[PDB]
Amino acid sequence: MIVLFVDFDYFYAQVEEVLNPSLKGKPVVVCVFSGRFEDSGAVATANYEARKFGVKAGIPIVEAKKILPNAVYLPMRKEVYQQVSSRIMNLLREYSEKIEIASIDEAYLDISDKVRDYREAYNLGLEIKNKILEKEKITVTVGISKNKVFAKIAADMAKPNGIKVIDDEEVKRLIRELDIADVPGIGNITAEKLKKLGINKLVDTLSIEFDKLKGMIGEAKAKYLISLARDEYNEPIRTRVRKSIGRIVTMKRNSRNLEEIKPYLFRAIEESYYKLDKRIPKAIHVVAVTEDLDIVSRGRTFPHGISKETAYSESVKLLQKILEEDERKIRRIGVRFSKFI
DNA sequence: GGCTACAGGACTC
DNA sequence: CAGGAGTCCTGTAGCC
Ligand SMILES: Nc1ccn([C@H]2C[C@H](O)[C@@H](COP(=O)(O)OP(=O)(O)OP(=O)(O)O)O2)c(=O)n1
Ligand SMILES: [Ca+2]
Ligand SMILES: [Ca+2]
Ligand SMILES: [Ca+2]
């Protein structure tokens, strides 16, 4: 199998750049304002010009400002990047019917019957890069290898505006030299558990006893890391179908008062139904982020679809359940719909 | 034993 | 100082 992975560079920021070329060359930070106080919120992303100084996704907006006081700060316009992302995806489909759209800016394509070997794949990747450049003026990084995982790993080795190929020989090398934390699916909680049993490399997952690995990180992640180590990982490029749609909002002040929370919960439901488009969910969950940023949720499935009225009524109950089974104050409240008809 | 719901957890965008 | 969003997995309890 020959997988070709596409990942758009500095996406939200680059898009803002395309729409306002004047932003070219300056540090740009795309922000998500929570409305709690001037500047409350987090960074969604920023361009390289702002990332070389430490301003990266996930940090507090106020933190970004002390580092880059004259940087350009823009409010995230999700619908614009989504619309842009679609056009590029509809463009990637011309290169293969076997395509998995993994996120707002990533796509996997199976080009097993479009190229003979890697030299041809490489060329098809250069062609894809240019087509996107011309048609949307967005740069992208292309990763190419024998499976989704190594194709992704390839892309972020060649980020940004790059293209890299990890041949079958490179794969065996990576299995021995690549730090296992750099493997998709391994975050610091898991990395810490791995770099605690001298597992710092994929290869040394084969010498560790199976149940020792399982009991630590779980059966799924263990079989996953082992299949990669043996160079047997073969997940197919599947068409993705949205499984859940939701909305969550930050409240002006923390609270445990139902009537003070209700307005925010109801707005989340209204906006959720709008996004639901014409999908009919059979399950609903009320999700709350607490005082200490922990996440709590309670949900329910119905033998039939949930109407907006049933959503309103059920959401209060679920929220009441959260309030009596947990003593912490709420900071963000929202809903999530799933199990679509 | 193992499958289903449900709630916590981890990861990534 | 901590946004908004979505997917997959696990331990538990109920059940056949
Ligand atoms: N914490 C995050 C992570 C991701 N995203 C978004 C906006 C990013 O532009 C888009 C792509 O995420 P990446 O992790 O790929 O970051 P960038 O594409 O912005 O930078 P890079 O060149 O490293 O791919 O996803 C976000 O809003 N908040
Ligand atoms: Ca990515
Ligand atoms: Ca990207
Ligand atoms: Ca990592």
Of residues A106, A136, A170, A314, which has the active-site annotation? A106
How many whole angstroms separate alpha carbon A61 and alpha carbon A32?
8
User: Which amino acid is residue A142, in one-letter code?
Assistant: V
Is-contact A46 A55, C-beta < 8 A? yes
Residue A164: closest CA among A177, A153, A154: A154
How many whole angstroms separate alpha carbon A288 and alpha carbon A325?
13
Residue A205 DSSP one-character state: G
Which CATH number is associated with domain A11-77?
3.40.1170.60
Which residue in this structure is represented by tokens 């079958």?
A168
Annotated binding-site residue? A7: yes
Residue A141: closest CA among A150, A151, A129, A131: A129
How many whole angstroms separate alpha carbon A195 and alpha carbon A80?
41
A58 touches strand B (CB under 7 A): yes
How many whole angstroms separate alpha carbon A168 and alpha carbon A149?
13
Which residue spans within chain A are E strands per DSSP?
3-8, 28-33, 41-46, 72-75, 99-103, 106-110, 140-145, 163-165, 244-255, 281-290, 295-301, 330-340
How many whole angstroms separate alpha carbon A60 and alpha carbon A57?
9
According to CATH, the topology of domain A2-10+78-166 is Alpha-Beta Plaits (3.30.70)
A106 is catalytic: yes
A74 touches strand C (CB under 7 A): no
Homologous superfamily in CATH for domain A244-336:
DNA polymerase, Y-family, little finger domain (3.30.1490.100)
- Between the alpha carbon of residue A316 and those of residues A249, A322, A334, the distances in Å are 16, 10, 11
Residue A269: closest CA among A322, A324, A333: A333
A289 CA, B7 C1': Å apart: 14
Q: Is A173 exposed, middle or buried (0-12, 13-18, 19+ CB in 10 A)?
A: exposed
Residue A228 DSSP one-character state: H
Mark the nucleotides of strand C covered by protein, meaning any atom under 7 Å from a CB.
Answer: 1-11
Q: Is A256 exposed, middle or buried (0-12, 13-18, 19+ CB in 10 A)?
A: middle
Homologous superfamily in CATH for domain A167-233:
5' to 3' exonuclease, C-terminal subdomain (1.10.150.20)
Pick out the nucleotide with least CA–C1' distance to A193: B10
Neighbouring-strand partners of residue A144: A4, A165
Q: Chain centroid to CA A219: how far?
A: 23
A130 CA, C6 C1': Å apart: 30
Sketch the domain layout of chain A as residue ranges. Answer: 2-10+78-166, 11-77, 167-233, 244-336
Neighbouring-strand partners of residue A337: A245, A284
Pocket test for ligand 1, best of A33, A45, A78, A161 (most atoms within 8 A of CB): A45
Q: Chain centroid to CA A341: how far?
A: 25
Output the residue whose Cα is nearest ligand 1's atom 24: A9
